[PDB]
Design a binder for these strands. Sequence first.
DNA 1: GCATGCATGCATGCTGCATGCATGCATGCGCATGCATGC
DNA 2: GCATGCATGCGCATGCATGCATGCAGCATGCATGCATGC
Lengths: 273, 104
Amino acid sequence: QTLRNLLSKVSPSFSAELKQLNQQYEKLFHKWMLQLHLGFNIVLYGLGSKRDLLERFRTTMLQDSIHVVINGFFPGISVKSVLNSITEEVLDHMGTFRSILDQLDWIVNKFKEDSSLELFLLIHNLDSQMLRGEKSQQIIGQLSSLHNIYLIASIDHLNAPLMWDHAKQSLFNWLWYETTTYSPYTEETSYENSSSLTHVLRSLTPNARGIFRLLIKYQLDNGLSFQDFYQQCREAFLVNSDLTLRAQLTEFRDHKLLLIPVDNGTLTDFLEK
Amino acid sequence: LIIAMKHLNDIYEEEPFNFQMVYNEFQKFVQRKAHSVYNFEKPVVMKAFEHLQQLELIKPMERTSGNSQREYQLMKLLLDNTQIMNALQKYPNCPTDVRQWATS
DNA sequence: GCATGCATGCATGCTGCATGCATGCATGCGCATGCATGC
DNA sequence: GCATGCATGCGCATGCATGCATGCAGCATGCATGCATGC
């Protein structure tokens, strides 16, 4: 999958229609801002990567106000991290919190006491694996229930409507907009995690390399019993005592290398290489 | 209910059971008899079963809740046939019909 | 001599029974962390 | 103000329960074949 890094040389097709499509999409920003500012939260749904449109909207209209961007497609994001970021910067508070619910209570009380605070949220790929928790969406909806917070979200998964319940629907107060941009999902697939054997075996002792080669050969022929494997290793004179063979087996185990959990085709290609 | 449970344990050798089978065979017993005064509905029998389980004469297997209701739950009896017979012999006012059903 | 009807043995299709293996789920344990308290 | 010890929350491994399939053997049934028997 390393070849992916070199695959970016392919040129796009029919880019003129995409240009007109983006120009048509650009004109809805004022209406979206008006709908946000009256107490509505907006979801964007449609085919194609819509990150570019959101970034354009931010850099065009949100350069004069406080705004927080969370690109949830990163698999390391959690709601507690968002809460900590809000507390540390929006309110500039450093004190730790005993529980998530207590942090939510503090934030709600602070925002209710201070009516001069306005915050904008820009969430990318709200359907992330880490944000699908019921408590996560409950927390986000409770946050969005305030009249001093504006929410723009994006949907890219098919089963998104199952996330929201009737009470959650009432809390979120959603409006929908269809914006299909046809953009490739380069960045959003970049962080996602869908050679090693050669590098490991390069610096290992040649006896271990031969033993592993024999093990691969037997595995491709048809798991070995310990006794038969020891006898065959004896026959090749790569082992002088069973303690040494078990030491080599433990060395292989330490690298997570009896069955080898490696695909047959990869082993066949590696043997000749 | 206990006599019905004993009959279930005899017919199905050492197997669990639920509320529905016991209710069905109790209904069979009260329907075979012409007009005996045992016309009871589901909720009262359910409450009686709950009380029996509360007294810890019946214990669940592989306890779980939510996934399985009180109904359709695998129950087992914690008594022996000779104990039931001896206790029934000393029952003060056991009716004839229930005694003969127990013997059958 | 032969055709027809009847009786029977066999092939086969259906179905009921016996069973192990993969996987999901609950649980117990054990470790990391934040808080109450004491000095 | 600090250290410490305790209560709590979460991750991980494990054992067990559940679903799911397939091959075999027995049985019933319908058909092919042999036998009797008259005209």
